[PDB]
Amino acid sequence: MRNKIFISHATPEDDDFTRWLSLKLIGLGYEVWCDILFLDKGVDFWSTIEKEIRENTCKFLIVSSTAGNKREGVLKELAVATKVKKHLQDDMFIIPLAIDENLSYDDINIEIVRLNAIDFKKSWAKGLQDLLDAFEKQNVPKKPPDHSKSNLLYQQIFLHDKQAIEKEETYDSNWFPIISFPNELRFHRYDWRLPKQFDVRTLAFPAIRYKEYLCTFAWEYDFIHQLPKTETYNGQESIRISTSDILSGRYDTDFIRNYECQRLIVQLINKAFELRMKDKNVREYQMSKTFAYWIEKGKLEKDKFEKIKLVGKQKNKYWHFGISAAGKLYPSPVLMVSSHIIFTMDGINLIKSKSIQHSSRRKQGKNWWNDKWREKLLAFIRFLSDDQNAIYLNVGSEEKILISNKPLKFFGKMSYVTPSEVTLEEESVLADINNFEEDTEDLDELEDIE
Amino acid sequence: MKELIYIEEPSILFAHGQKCTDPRDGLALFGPLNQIYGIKSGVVGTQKGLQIFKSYLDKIQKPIYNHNNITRPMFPGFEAVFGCKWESQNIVFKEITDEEIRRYLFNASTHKRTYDLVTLFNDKIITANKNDEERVDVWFVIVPEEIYKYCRPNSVLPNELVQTKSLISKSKAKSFRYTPTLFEEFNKKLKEVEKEAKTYNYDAQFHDQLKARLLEHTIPTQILRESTLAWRDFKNTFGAPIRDFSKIEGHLAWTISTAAYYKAGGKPWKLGDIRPGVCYLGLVYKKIEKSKNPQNACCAAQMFLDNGDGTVFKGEVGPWYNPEKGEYHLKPKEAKALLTQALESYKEQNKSYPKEVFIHARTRFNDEEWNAFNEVTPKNTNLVGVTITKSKPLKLYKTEGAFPIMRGNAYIVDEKKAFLWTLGFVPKLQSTLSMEVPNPIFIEINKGEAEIQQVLKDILALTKLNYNACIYADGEPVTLRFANKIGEILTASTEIKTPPLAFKYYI
């Protein structure tokens, strides 16, 4: 028994349409055959197509487009359908579907002109309704509507490679764990020995003023040079608090609460990072409330560290990769690092305007994808390392804080099939089109540059 | 290492009970959730605007193709997608001649120019809605490019195009409202000064001011620039288009069609996996810059159940902003009133009180506000307060390849704090929704007891309920995404007393 519906069309074009009508017809109970849904690329398809036209097809639909009227396969299928129509004496065996507004009725094959085509040009819904009316008037066999079948076919055929697949993925983070801490946190009771107007940020080692005390991991003698009044200070007057007890939450005394000690340790980590950055001779860029550190042009051989470029060019302006770090303790004692891009005119002198920096950063980062960000961050962090495994944040003459150069790695159990990066380039090109609705206030600074 | 859990992609329900992951695919294959008779479009604007609108409708009645059909699927046509007619014939048109626009467009004061133009448009819309026998489902405003360019808070008219000078300065106007007591028979000059000072009561944003002034009349509105619809006709000095939309024509048609269908009374889609008796509330805060007290702010709450069709409640205006912390908090009485209104609206709609209530906010809740919330929650209802913030950056970089981390991966710090990736690679689109490396949102359960994985799934699902733009997913849940827009619209005017509950008037 002939109960199938045949939709003939072009492969590269006439692809999106066939999909809509086919799914729509199958969802309405019609048994439909089209090479998009039932043909696996690589097999000799002509024998199967000829068999389905000759043996199982009741209505033959040909999509009449500009490329449909010239494609060789469409013409062969139409010839087979014409032979079958002559055999069956069914003058309505071939039902044309006109979808191209530029296809005149004289450009349609002379065999197809005599058949009343269904107007899909103006509206696809009206064409579908006309097709359904014609099918009802011709008693085309159909089953009760089951849209689940169309949904299942869509998911199986056009979403096979477009689903999350199970595969372990290792993700590098921007959290760099702290291997060790100094044994004790010390509160030196300097009182008068510390003038009330002394800026503790000028000390050679991190320190914080807390009441009449000085909170640091460093010893009393580490500040004799810069605070000569502390030469006569007794070491037994210091309140030494174990760091492990602070971090583990077991520290409970009336002198100071545990969260205050953790906050002081965070501030000391930040100060040690600032001093380490000043020790590495990296420039400073003042952000809203924190500092970003970037590398000056010509500091690194060919502006590259381990074959990774850190200083480059962007039109007439130069871009620098920079990091800004803040200490964290709660999830785990890590050193949080954020990535920044900082621009200069000649490689040394900063750009004073903030909106120029913002626009240039967005423009440069649009073309920087996962690999570029990860490689540049890792290269920067390995630039700061003192050995192969960790970077040392000096906090005292004998006390140091060790931070690994290997980020805290994360792993997940679900992955994706990696496509071509041309999609990434396309999204980059398309980002500005969407951003033209929110970036109409930064267009004056660009004219200010010229 | 630290383990990442995976949250499956939330499916959304469509017509005939079929579920899909992409709104475009579901709309194209099965259609919207509910069908409407049609869309009776009303247009206010220039004659060129009406011609552009009619051309755009005639264009979207027929399919529009994109270069890459995977990330941005084509538009099969309005009738083939939604099943309802959107004809360009029989359109209620209220013309705004170019002379009328030029009369008010060349005023030095941005506030006065915006107020005058918005008054023109709003008066036309109101008169048409009140005196015409033909009802209009959605009113479409075709704003000319000059109005969009010169009617924004930071827009300055060049000194060559200034024809009418400003009669009052910004500081002098800000120092008029609070010291009214004009107390006198005033020369016409002082009455014009008074009128301009009153225009200073409204924001300079054209779209937001028009929405705020049209809220009280329950008139849906869609605001479209002329170059959004006919971008080929708007060329710069070099001959190239000012805005090149040749690559998102299908996406633009999808967005405009979905917005128009939603505003006309139809619901396009809804969540496929629904938890019965669950109600999400989005606590929204916006500062009133026109207040005598700098701490004053306007508080709003938005209720969503399974679709994007939400309910908006406007709270009272009072000193909610805390300058020392940069956090907003309601006093007990106002919090109780807001939550009682939300719960009573839910009881009216669904005939029974919700089983679970989730309040999403951008700041932590204090004990006073939470006790106020609990005093009005029924004993059989679970109340949970969740804060979603983007300020805690945990950037993960995939070791191999240039593509970012897949959407849906989550990191659970503890029973109440977790990281969720609403941005990243999407297997269905075979591309990424965010540039550079996506920023996860930080999800924290401060108050109440609730399982963290269920909250993550609910937030990922709520990400799918943006009816203003037919995109696959947003960066934030719908309970918080429209916080800024709704706050700005509510605060654009100080004369809004009883705004409407329906969500379609705020976007």
Query: What's phi and psi for A344, nearest 5 deg?
Result: -135, 155
- Picking from B9, B79, B398, the nearest residue to A169 by CB comes out as B398
**Which among A373, A419, A436 has the least Cβ separation from residue B430?**
A419
Residue A283 domain flag: no
SS3 label, residue A178: strand
Task: Note whether B228 and B315 are same-domain residues.
Answer: no
- What are the tokens at B437? 């490396």
Residue A151 lies in a domain: yes
Q: Any idea what the CATH number is for the domain that residue A67 is in?
A: 3.40.50.10140
Which region holds residue B448: left if phi is over 0, alpha if psi is between -120 and 50, else beta? left
Contact A105, A115 (CB under 8 A): no
Nearest alpha-carbon partner for B43 in B87, B85, B94: B94
Handedness of CA A420, B422, A360, A301 (dihedral sign): negative
Please list the residues that pair with A283 across neighbouring strands: A294
Q: Which amino acid is at A259?
A: Y
- Nearest CA to B212 out of B100, B118, B149, B290 is that of B118
| Cα B197 from Cα B206, distance rounded (Å) | 18
In a domain, A268, yes or no: no
CA distances from A212 to A188, A205, A207, A243, B329 (A): 8, 18, 13, 21, 36
The answer to whether B257 touches B75, Cβ cutoff 8 Å, is: yes
Closest by CA to B441, choosing from B423, B426, B463, is B423
Closest CA to B317 of B302, B303, B334, B342: B334
Contact in structure between B82 and B14 (CB atoms under 8 Å): no
Q: How far apart are CA B69 and CA B24, in angstroms?
A: 11
Query: For residues B23 and B472, is the Cβ–Cβ distance under 8 A?
Result: yes
Location of structure tokens 């950055």: A277
Which CATH number does the domain housing residue B75 bear?
A: 3.40.50
d(Cα A204, Cα A233) in Å, to the nearest integer? Answer: 19
Contact residues for B178 (Cβ-Cβ < 8 A; gap 6+): B292
Assess if residue B28 is contained within a domain.
no
Give strand ranges (E) for B414-487.
417-420, 425-426, 431-432, 441-447
Q: Which of A370, A414, A424 should one mutate to test binding to chain B, selecting the residue with the greatest count of B CBs within 10 A?
A: A370
Q: List, edge to edge, every strand of the sheet that includes A31-33.
A: A31-33, A4-8, A57-64, A94-98, A118-119
Given A122, A421, A433, which is nearest B61 (Cβ)?
A122
CA distance A365 to A130: 51
B471 and B360 within one domain: yes
Inter-chain CB proximity B4 and A411 less than 8 Å:
yes
Q: Quick check: A311 and A344 in contact, CB under 8 A?
A: no
> How far is the C-alpha of B424 from the C-alpha of B431, rounded, in Å?
8
Nearest CA-CA partner of A132 in A15, A21, A46, A33: A21
Asked if B401 is an interface residue toward chain A (Cβ–Cβ < 8 A), one would say yes
Does residue B285 share a domain with residue B247?
A: no
Token pair for A224: 């004799």
Range 121-150 of B in CB contact (< 8 A) with A: none
Residue A19: half-sphere exposure toward Cβ, Cα within 13 Å: 21
Residue B461 lies in a domain: yes
> Does the residue A130 lie in any domain?
yes
Domain stop point among B242, B263, B284: B263
Clarify whether residues B222 and B316 are in a common domain.
no
Solving technique for this entry? cryo-EM
What are the structure tokens assigned to B346, written together? 């839910």
The CA distances from residue A185 to A64, A202, A214, A242, A275, in Å, are: 82, 20, 10, 6, 19
User: Which residue segment(s) compose the domain that A99 sits in?
Assistant: 4-158
Give residues with Cβ within 8 angstroms of B84, minimum separation 6: B35, B36, B37, B38, B39, B78, B261, B266
* Cα–Cα dist B442/B460, whole Å: 13
Nearest to B342 by CA among B298, B288, B369, B378: B378
DSSP-derived letter for residue A367 is T
Structural domain of residue B79, as residue ranges? 41-161+204-263
Same domain, B245 and B331: no
Q: Does B135 fall in a domain?
A: yes
Q: Tell whether B403 lies on the interface with A, counting CB pairs under 8 A.
A: yes
For A219, A226, A227, A277, B124, the CA distances from A204, given in Å and listed in that order, are 12, 8, 11, 13, 72
Report the alpha-carbon distance of residue A10 to residue A103 in Å, rounded: 15
Q: Which residue has the tokens 């970012």?
A: B404
On whether the CB atoms of residues B422 and B476 are closer than 8 A, the answer is yes
How many CB atoms lie under 10 A from the CB of residue B180? 10
* CA–CA distances in Å: residue A362 to residues A343, A355, A366, A382, A444: 11, 11, 6, 25, 16
Kindly state whether residue B443 falls inside one of the protein's structural domains: yes
A433, B248: Cβ pair inside 8 Å? yes
d(CA A46, CA A73): 9
Q: Kindly state the helix (H) or strand (E) to which residue A173 belongs, with its residue range.
A: strand A165-173
Q: Are strands A283-286 and A291-294 parallel, antiparallel or unpaired?
A: antiparallel
Return phi, psi of residue B375, to 5°: -65, -20
Q: Are A232 and A293 in contact (CB under 8 A)?
A: no
Based on its alpha-carbon atoms, the radius of gyration of chain B, rounded to whole angstroms, reads 24
| A24, A371, A434 member nearest B402 (Cβ) | A371
Task: Please report, as a single letter, which amino acid is at residue B502.
Answer: A
Name the nearest CA neighbour of B303 among B336, B329, B341. Answer: B341
- Taking residue B334's Cβ as centre, other Cβ atoms within 10 Å add up to 18
CA angle B494, B500, B501 (to 5 degrees): 125
Co-location of B147 and B274 in the same domain: no
Q: Taking a C-beta distance cutoff of 8 angstroms, is the pair B151, B114 a contact?
A: yes
B36-75 residues touching A, CB cutoff 8 A: 61-63, 65, 67-71, 74
Residue B15 included in any domain:
no
Of B411, B432, B435, the CB nearest to A366: B435
Per this entry, what is the length of chain B?
507
Helix (H) or strand (E) holding A272: helix A258-279
The whole-angstrom separation of Cα A120 and Cα A101 is 9
Residue B12 lies in a domain: no
Tokens representing A391 are 């970077």
CATH number of the domain that B457 lies in? 3.30.420.10
Rounded CA gap, A288 and A306, in Å?
31
- H-run or E-run covering B410: strand B409-412
Domain boundary among B263, B297, B331: B263
φ, ψ at A335 (rounded to 5°): -115, 105
Contact B298, B288 (CB under 8 A): yes
Confirm if B458 and B301 have CB atoms less than 8 A apart. no
**Strands A94-98, A57-64: pairing kind:** parallel
Report the distance separating Cα A32 and Cα A59, nearest Å.
10
Residue after which a domain boundary falls, among B263, B278, B301? B263
Mapped onto helix, strand or coil, the DSSP state of residue B12 is strand
- Check CB contact under 8 Å for A151 and B431: no
Domain co-membership, B499 together with B427 = yes
User: If you write DSSP's letter for every residue of A127-157 in order, what string do you get?
Assistant: HHHHHHHHHHHTT---PSP-HHHHHHHHHHH
Judge whether B71 lies within some domain.
yes
H-helix or E-strand spanning residue A277:
helix A258-279
What is the Cα–Cα distance from A435 to A362, expressed in whole angstroms?
A: 11
A230-255 core/surface letters (b: 16 or more CB in 10 A; e: else): beebeeeebeebebeebbeeebeeee
CA-based radius of gyration for chain A: 36
A326 within 8 A of A298, measured Cβ to Cβ: no
Tokens for B395, please give them.
């950037």
Is A172 annotated for ligand binding? no
Give yes or no: residues B223 and B335 share one domain: no
Give burial (CB, 10 Å; 0-12/13-18/19+) of B234.
Answer: middle
Please tell me the distance from the alpha carbon of residue B402 to that of residue A372, in angstroms, as a whole number.
8
Q: Where are the beta strands (DSSP E) in B46-134?
A: 92-95
The tokens describing A308, both together, are 């990774």
Three-state DSSP class for residue B95: strand
Q: Which CA distances in Å does B42 have to B45, B116, B240?
A: 10, 21, 32
Same domain, B63 and B154: yes
Label the pairing between strands A410-415 and B2-6.
parallel
Catalogue the E-assigned strands of B63-197: 92-95, 138-143
Nearest residue of B to residue A378, measured between CA atoms: B397
Asked if the structure places residue A217 within a domain, the reply is no
The distance of Cα B494 from the centroid of its chain, to the nearest Å, equals 19
Both structure tokens of A113: 């002109």
Please, which residues bridge with residue A242 across strands?
A184
Determine the angle formed by the axes of helices A422-435 and A354-366, rounding to 10 degrees: 150
In B175-304, which ranges are E strands? 221-225, 270-271, 278-287, 296-304
Indicate the number of domains in chain B. Answer: 2
Q: After which residues is chain B broken (C to N over 2.5 A)?
A: none
How close B244 gets to chain A, by Cα (Å)?
A: 7
Distance from CA of B276 to the nearest CA of A (A): 24
- Cα A142 to the center of its chain, rounded Å: 46
- Token pair recorded at residue B172: 């002098």
Name every residue whose Cβ is closer than 8 Å to that of residue A146 and which is 6 or more positions away in sequence. A27, A29
For residues B59 and B230, the answer to whether their CB atoms sit within 8 Å is: no
What is the CB neighbour count within 10 angstroms for residue B103?
15
d(CA A247, CA A196): 30
Residues B142 and B209 in one domain: yes
How far apart CA B327 and CA B304 sit, in angstroms, is 24
Instruction: Pick left, alpha or beta for residue A370 (phi over 0 → left; psi -120 to 50 → alpha; otherwise beta).
Output: alpha
**Residue owning tokens 């990696």:** A418
Q: Give A 97-116 residues with CB within 8 A of chain B.
A: 101
Q: Do A159 and B248 touch (CB under 8 A)?
A: no
Distance CA B298, CA B495 (A): 13
Give SS3 for B200.
coil
DSSP H or E stretch at residue B361? strand B356-361
The verdict on residue A294 lying in a domain is no
Same-domain status, B373 and B242: no
Asked if A236 reaches chain B (Cβ–Cβ under 8 Å), the answer is no
Rounded to the nearest 10 degrees, the angle between the axes of helix B110-131 and helix B98-105 is 150
CA distance linking residue A246 with residue A215, whole number of Å: 14
Report d(CA B318, CA B301) in Å as an integer: 15
Within a domain: A214: no
The total domain count for chain A is 1
Residues shown for chain A: 450
CA distance B144 to B149: 9
Residue B174 falls inside a structural domain: no
| DSSP letter string, A194-235 | S-TT--GGGSSS--EEETTEEEESS-GGGGTTT-GGGGG--G
Strands (E) across B99-190 are located at 138-143
How far apart are alpha carbons A32 and A20 in whole angstroms? Answer: 12
What secondary structure letter does DSSP report for B233? G
Same domain, residue pair B340 and B408: yes
Q: Does A170 touch chain B (CB under 8 A)?
A: yes
Report d(CA B109, CA B396) in Å as an integer: 48
Residue A371 lies in a domain: no
Query: Residue B393, exposed/middle/buried by CB under 10 A (0-12, 13-18, 19+)?
Result: middle
SS3 B222: strand
A88 touches chain B (CB under 8 A): no
3-state secondary structure of A25: helix
